[PDB]
Protein backbone atom coordinates (compact mmCIF):
# COMPACT_ATOMS: atom_id res chain seq x y z
CA UNK A 1 0.00 0.00 0.00
CA UNK A 2 0.98 3.67 -0.14
CA UNK A 3 2.91 5.35 2.66
CA UNK A 4 -0.27 7.36 3.06
CA UNK A 5 -3.41 5.63 4.30
CA UNK A 6 -1.52 2.95 6.27
CA UNK A 7 -3.95 1.60 8.80
CA UNK A 8 -2.18 -0.23 11.62
CA UNK A 9 -1.16 0.53 15.15
CA UNK A 10 2.03 2.63 15.25
CA UNK A 11 3.16 0.69 18.32
CA UNK A 12 5.26 -2.43 18.01
CA UNK A 13 3.26 -5.44 19.13
CA UNK A 14 4.99 -7.68 21.64
CA UNK A 15 5.10 -10.34 18.94
CA UNK A 16 7.09 -8.13 16.59
CA UNK A 17 9.56 -7.02 19.24
CA UNK A 18 10.09 -10.66 20.14
CA UNK A 19 10.99 -11.66 16.58
CA UNK A 20 13.02 -8.50 15.91
CA UNK A 21 15.33 -8.97 18.87
CA UNK A 22 15.61 -12.61 17.90
CA UNK A 23 16.36 -12.08 14.22
CA UNK A 24 18.76 -9.24 14.95
CA UNK A 25 20.66 -11.21 17.57
CA UNK A 26 21.06 -14.06 15.11
CA UNK A 27 22.69 -11.72 12.62
CA UNK A 28 25.02 -10.16 15.20
CA UNK A 29 25.93 -13.68 16.26
CA UNK A 30 27.29 -14.24 12.77
CA UNK A 31 29.85 -11.52 12.03
CA UNK A 32 27.24 -8.93 11.29
CA UNK A 33 28.01 -5.19 11.49
CA UNK A 34 26.77 -3.56 14.69
CA UNK A 35 24.98 -0.24 14.39
CA UNK A 36 25.55 0.95 17.94
CA UNK A 37 28.67 1.41 20.02
CA UNK A 38 29.08 -1.75 22.08
CA UNK A 39 30.76 -1.48 25.48
CA UNK A 40 31.73 -4.66 27.28
CA UNK A 41 29.19 -6.80 25.41
CA UNK A 42 30.01 -10.33 24.29
CA UNK A 43 26.34 -11.41 24.26
CA UNK A 44 24.27 -10.88 21.08
CA UNK A 45 20.86 -10.62 22.77
CA UNK A 46 22.10 -7.74 24.91
CA UNK A 47 23.57 -6.01 21.88
CA UNK A 48 20.43 -6.45 19.80
CA UNK A 49 18.35 -5.26 22.74
CA UNK A 50 20.56 -2.18 22.88
CA UNK A 51 20.22 -1.42 19.17
CA UNK A 52 16.47 -1.47 19.65
CA UNK A 53 16.22 1.25 22.30
CA UNK A 54 18.40 3.44 20.07
CA UNK A 55 16.18 2.56 17.08
CA UNK A 56 19.18 1.52 15.02
CA UNK A 57 17.96 -1.90 13.90
CA UNK A 58 17.95 -2.27 10.09
CA UNK A 59 14.74 -4.24 9.55
CA UNK A 60 11.46 -3.30 7.92
CA UNK A 61 8.43 -5.22 9.12
CA UNK A 62 5.95 -6.34 6.49
CA UNK A 63 2.48 -6.53 8.03
CA UNK A 64 -0.04 -8.52 6.04
CA UNK A 65 -3.50 -7.11 6.35
CA UNK A 66 -6.09 -9.90 6.49
CA UNK A 67 -7.47 -9.12 3.03
CA UNK A 68 -4.19 -10.07 1.32
CA UNK A 69 -2.54 -6.65 1.14
CA UNK A 70 0.48 -5.64 3.22
CA UNK A 71 2.27 -2.69 4.80
CA UNK A 72 5.98 -2.09 5.32
CA UNK A 73 6.97 -0.49 8.63
CA UNK A 74 10.61 0.13 9.39
CA UNK A 75 11.69 -0.52 12.96
CA UNK A 76 12.38 3.19 13.39
CA UNK A 77 8.89 4.31 12.35
CA UNK A 78 7.23 2.06 14.93
CA UNK A 79 7.00 3.16 18.56
CA UNK A 80 8.60 0.82 21.06
CA UNK A 81 6.09 -0.23 23.69
CA UNK A 82 8.66 -0.87 26.42
CA UNK B 1 -2.70 22.99 36.89
CA UNK B 2 0.35 20.85 36.17
CA UNK B 3 -1.16 17.73 37.73
CA UNK B 4 -4.04 17.81 35.29
CA UNK B 5 -1.75 18.19 32.28
CA UNK B 6 0.33 15.33 33.67
CA UNK B 7 -2.79 13.27 34.28
CA UNK B 8 -4.04 13.44 30.71
CA UNK B 9 -0.56 12.42 29.66
CA UNK B 10 -0.76 9.02 31.33
CA UNK B 11 -4.44 8.36 30.61
CA UNK B 12 -3.30 8.20 26.99
CA UNK B 13 -0.21 6.07 27.58
CA UNK B 14 -1.98 3.71 29.97
CA UNK B 15 -4.86 3.26 27.52
CA UNK B 16 -2.73 2.76 24.41
CA UNK B 17 -1.00 -0.06 26.26
CA UNK B 18 -4.29 -1.88 26.80
CA UNK B 19 -5.20 -2.19 23.11
CA UNK B 20 -5.17 -5.78 21.89
CA UNK B 21 -2.14 -6.79 19.99
CA UNK B 22 -2.65 -7.78 16.37
CA UNK B 23 -1.57 -11.38 16.17
CA UNK B 24 -2.67 -12.64 19.57
CA UNK B 25 -4.06 -16.14 19.40
CA UNK B 26 -7.36 -15.47 21.08
CA UNK B 27 -9.13 -18.79 20.72
CA UNK B 28 -6.29 -20.41 22.60
CA UNK B 29 -6.91 -17.83 25.33
CA UNK B 30 -10.68 -18.11 25.53
CA UNK B 31 -10.66 -21.89 25.26
CA UNK B 32 -8.22 -22.32 28.12
CA UNK B 33 -9.79 -19.71 30.40
CA UNK B 34 -13.23 -21.27 30.27
CA UNK B 35 -11.96 -24.81 30.78
CA UNK B 36 -9.31 -24.16 33.40
CA UNK B 37 -11.93 -23.45 36.11
CA UNK B 38 -13.76 -26.55 34.91
CA UNK B 39 -11.19 -28.77 36.63
CA UNK B 40 -12.21 -27.22 39.97
CA UNK B 41 -15.95 -27.19 39.26
UniProtKB/Swiss-Prot annotation, chain B:
It comes from the Eukaryota. It is found in: Nucleus; Cytoplasm; Chromosome. The tandem heptapeptide repeats in the C-terminal domain (CTD) can be highly phosphorylated. The phosphorylation activates Pol II. Phosphorylation occurs mainly at residues 'Ser-2' and 'Ser-5' of the heptapeptide repeat and is mediated, at least, by CDK7 and CDK9. POLR2A associated with DNA is specifically phosphorylated at 'Ser-5' of the CTD by CDK7, promoting transcription initiation by triggering dissociation from DNA. Phosphorylated at 'Ser-2', Ser-5' and 'Ser-7' of the CTD by CDK9 (P-TEFb complex), promoting transcription elongation. Transmembrane segments: none annotated. Catalytic core component of RNA polymerase II (Pol II), a DNA-dependent RNA polymerase which synthesizes mRNA precursors and many functional non-coding RNAs using the four ribonucleoside triphosphates as substrates. Pol II-mediated transcription cycle proceeds through transcription initiation, transcription elongation and transcription termination stages. Component of the RNA polymerase II (Pol II) core complex consisting of 12 subunits: a ten-subunit catalytic core composed of POLR2A/RPB1, POLR2B/RPB2, POLR2C/RPB3, POLR2I/RPB9, POLR2J/RPB11, POLR2E/RPABC1, POLR2F/RPABC2, POLR2H/RPABC3, POLR2K/RPABC4 and POLR2L/RPABC5 and a mobile stalk composed of two subunits POLR2D/RPB4 and POLR2G/RPB7, protruding from the core and functioning primarily in transcription initiation. Part of Pol II(G) complex, in which Pol II core associates with an additional subunit POLR2M; unlike conventional Pol II, Pol II(G) functions as a transcriptional repressor. Belongs to the RNA polymerase beta' chain family. The C-terminal domain (CTD) serves as a platform for assembly of factors that regulate transcription initiation, elongation, termination and mRNA processing. The trigger loop allows entry of NTPs into the active site, switching between an open and closed state with each NTP addition cycle. This is DNA-directed RNA polymerase II subunit RPB1. It comes from Cricetulus griseus (Chinese hamster). The chain holds residues 1062 to 1102 of 1970 of the full protein.
Amino acid sequence: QANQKRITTPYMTKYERARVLGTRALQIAMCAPVMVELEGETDPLLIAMKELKARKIPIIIRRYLPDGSYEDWGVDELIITD
Amino acid sequence: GEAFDWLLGEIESKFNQAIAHPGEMVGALAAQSLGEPATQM
